[PDB]
Amino acid sequence: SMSTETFGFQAEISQLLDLIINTFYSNKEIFLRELISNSSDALDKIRYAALTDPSQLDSEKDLYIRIIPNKEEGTLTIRDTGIGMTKADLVNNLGTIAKSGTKAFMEALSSGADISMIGQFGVGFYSSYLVAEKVQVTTKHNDDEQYIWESAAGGTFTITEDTEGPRLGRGTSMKLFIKEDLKEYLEEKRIREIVKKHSEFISYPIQLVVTK
Ligand SMILES: [Cl-]
């Protein structure tokens, strides 16, 4: 972790985060489906890139999704060995089309759409704020350095070159700091029932690390 740069969110994204954070939803568990689907997409991208350049997998040959709850730290981590994100991807809303898609999503919500449809607008990453008060995204793309993106959805996010953290090799590790009253989402049984309900058949292994 080196020099930290602070960026403002685009107005529509701050407006959406306020809606995600301060509205009651009965189906907040859909955040996990969105992150797992995003990880599966990132894994498909590295595989596709490796079709024409096999050395793209040299940085990490094992393609998987791994979920690590940590009740002591109050965090849920979703790690994949997908294509990762460059710094430019991180700046450009974690590689999404959030510029236009958050506004479109909020217009759909005002007309009766459900929060679970957030992934149809390409901005499913922001669903992490349904259960997390802060998110730290560590990421490593073959073409760039390892970075840490962080935001507590207070109008800004930071990007820091990660020189002191464990090397990912390639991919993205999303660490969610779960809100005080939503700690059920660190429970092993809750996590497994959610993965089974919404993410039962995907193309990659989903690993859950349980500690004793
Ligand atoms: Cl703006």
- Sheet-strand content, in percent, reads 15-25%
Count the strands?
A: 8
General shape: globular
Estimate the helix proportion, in percent. Answer: 25-40%
**Strand order in space, largest sheet:** 1-6-5-4-7-3-2-8
Subcellular location: Cytoplasm
Family: Belongs to the heat shock protein 90 family.
Binding site for ATP: 34, 38, 80, 85, 93, 99-101, 120-125, 172
Domain Histidine kinase/HSP90-like ATPase: 27-182
Top keywords for this entry?
monomer; 212 residues; alpha+beta; eight-stranded mixed β-sheet; 5 helices; binds chloride ion
Question: Explain this structure to me?
Answer:
This protein is of the alpha+beta class and 212 residues long. The chain has one domain. Helix content is 30%, strand content 23%. An 8-stranded mixed sheet has the order 1-6-5-4-7-3-2-8. The longest helix has 23 residues, at 30-52. It binds chloride ion. Residues 10-11 line the site of chloride ion. Chloride ion binds next to loops. Residues 27-182 form the Histidine kinase/HSP90-like ATPase domain.
SSE order and pairing:
Layout: E1 4-8, H1 11-22, H2 30-52, E2 65-70, E3 75-80, H3 87-91, H4 98-110, E4 132-140, E5 146-151, E6 156-161, E7 171-178, H5 188-198, E8 206-208
Residues 10-11 line the site of chloride ion.
Describe this structure in a few short sentences.
By secondary structure, the chain is α+β, with helices and mostly antiparallel strands.
